[PDB]
């Protein structure tokens, strides 16, 4: 099970989630179960936390192949969070048993995808480039921002979300 | 957890490997080893019933201070398939060059 697109809308008003189940033959029995949204405040390592930001159960929408693909567009202001200074964690679940021929390690019910707003980062890069235009010297804040973004990338791809939030809160919010 | 076990075993094995090669490890790092294995036995014992999720948050965010502190303790690696910017593999398929009253359309 995987993500098709997991993006925040360019208008900074919707959080786009478009999930799908993998096309391989032995997820025929497997479906999509729920969508749980967490922020940098309510995250826990062991799956979604209690009192989450927004829970979604997918039988509610439909009345079986329609249930294998889902698309959500959440008005972020309705979630009562800041679209610019929020890092969303999007969990998904399966509620379904694959066949007995699955190769090992592929049978995992849950996934996760981190989300942030790239507009503030784009504005910071534009500001630093404007500074570079004057006298052709590289500000050190620009290199610091680049390397800290790469640090958060490494933390996310290695799954070390606690230190990822620590860096986010320490550098890209305050 | 089953992972605090692995980190603690790795840390103390590295500690005794250093004491085999050298004859000295900084006690400022022996303190970190002590904290680490004390926490793991705390969480894998009869005192794991007194922890809320806020306590879990605090414990994890305090243990991550020990992650890259010394060579004995390392940043754990989890199975992750995410990133800060994701790829858009959606495909475009309009219907016989049609549009809605305002915009485009697809299958």
């Amino acid at each position: 099970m995987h993500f098709n697109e997991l993006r925040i809308s360019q208008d900074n008003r919707f959080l786009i989630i478009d999930v799908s189940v993998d096309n391989q033959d032995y997820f025929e029995d497997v479906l999509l179960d729920s969508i749980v949204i967490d922020t940098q405040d309510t995250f826990v390592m062991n799956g979604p936390s209690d009192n989450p930001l927004y829970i979604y159960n997918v039988e509610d929408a439909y009345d079986t192949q329609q249930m294998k693909n889902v698309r959500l567009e959440l008005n972020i202001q309705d979630l009562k969070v800041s679209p610019c200074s929020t890092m969303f964690f999007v969990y998904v679940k399966s509620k379904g048993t694959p066949s007995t021929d699955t190769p090992c390690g592929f049978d995992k019910d849950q996934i996760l995808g981190t989300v942030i707003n790239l507009q503030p980062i784009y504005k910071q890069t534009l500001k630093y480039l404007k500074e570079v235009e004057c006298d052709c010297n590289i500000p050190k804040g620009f290199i610091d921002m680049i390397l800290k973004l790469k640090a958060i990338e490494l933390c996310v791809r290695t799954g070390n979300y606690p230190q990822a939030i620590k860096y986010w809160n320490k550098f890209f919010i305050k | 957890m089953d992972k605090m076990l692995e980190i603690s075993e790795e840390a103390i094995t590295r500690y005794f490997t250093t004491l085999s090669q050298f004859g000295y490890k900084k006690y400022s790092d022996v303190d970190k080893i002590i904290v680490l294995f004390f926490m793991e036995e705390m969480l894998a014992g009869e005192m794991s019933y007194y922890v809320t999720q806020d306590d879990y948050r605090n414990i994890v965010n305090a243990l991550y201070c020990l992650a890259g502190s010394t060579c004995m303790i390392d940043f754990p690696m989890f199975e992750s398939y995410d990133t800060l910017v994701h790829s858009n593999n959606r495909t475009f398929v309009p219907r016989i060059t049609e549009d809605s009253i305002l915009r485009s359309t697809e299958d």
Binding site: - | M1, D2, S48, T52, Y56
Partner: peptide
């Protein structure tokens, strides 16, 4: 794997609901 207090509360409440 790890449990907190709230996890046990959910489990026991869900047991008692269906008994």
């Amino acid at each position: 794997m790890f449990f907190t207090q709230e996890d046990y509360r959910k489990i026991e409440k869900w047991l008692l609901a269906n008994s």
